Design a protein around this ligand. Structure first.
Ligand code: NI
Length: 208
């Protein structure tokens, strides 16, 4: 029926969400999952939040990604207000007005990574590899675990995703396969906007 997680709240703030939850009989969990219907973000007054993992996974799953004002306003009026009317407009990274949560909310047929094969390659910080994988697989990509496991042929498109920082060689990936190499920001920017970005900005230089 209805299930929520929260992001960027103080315990005090969390308490009000639980209050909201009890009142309306909304489920409340710590981990976002398949079932999660709602993601409550701490935003500023114009509905701009931090770019948190729950934010990415919420957009990726076509959920409601709603400002915490949905909660406090709904408590202030003893009624559950319009999820539509509080939705997140953007974030500190991708701009204050991009409206990706809704793009994703409606565009579940035209998924930004339809047709792609993605290998999240090497080591990653601030975000478990499997959650990034889950994220791209939620956006309609096929996940590959080994550079050598890419589906040779055409009609399909492989991409290697890395986070440069994380390694003590990421220019010498092209020596091991025939795919564009891009940074994690390709995915993250793409997911935040729910618009597949052009690799240009994100391509990493590969040695012959
Ligand atoms: Ni093509």
């Amino acid at each position: 029926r209805m299930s929520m997680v929260v992001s960027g709240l103080t315990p005090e703030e969390f308490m009000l969400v639980y209050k909201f939850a009890r009142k309306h009989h909304i489920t409340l969990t710590n981990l976002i999952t398949e079932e999660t219907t709602h993601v409550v973000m701490k935003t500023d007054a114009e509905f701009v939040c931090e770019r948190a993992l729950k934010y990415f996974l919420g957009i990726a799953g076509g959920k409601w990604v709603v400002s915490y004002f949905w909660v406090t306003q709904s408590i202030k009026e003893r009624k559950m207000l319009n999820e539509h009317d509080f939705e997140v407009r953007g974030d500190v990274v991708n701009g204050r007005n991009h409206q990706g949560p809704k793009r994703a909310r409606e565009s579940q047929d035209r998924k930004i990574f339809r047709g792609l094969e993605i290998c999240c390659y090497g080591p990653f910080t601030n975000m478990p590899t499997d959650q990034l994988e889950w994220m791209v697989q939620l956006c309609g990509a096929s996940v590959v675990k080994e550079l050598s496991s890419f589906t040779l042929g055409t009609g399909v498109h492989p991409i290697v995703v890395v986070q440069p920082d994380a390694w003590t060689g990421f220019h010498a990936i092209g020596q091991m396969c025939e795919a564009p190499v891009v940074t994690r920001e390709w995915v993250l920017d793409s997911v935040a906007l729910y618009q597949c970005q052009e690799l240009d900005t994100y391509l990493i230089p590969q040695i012959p």
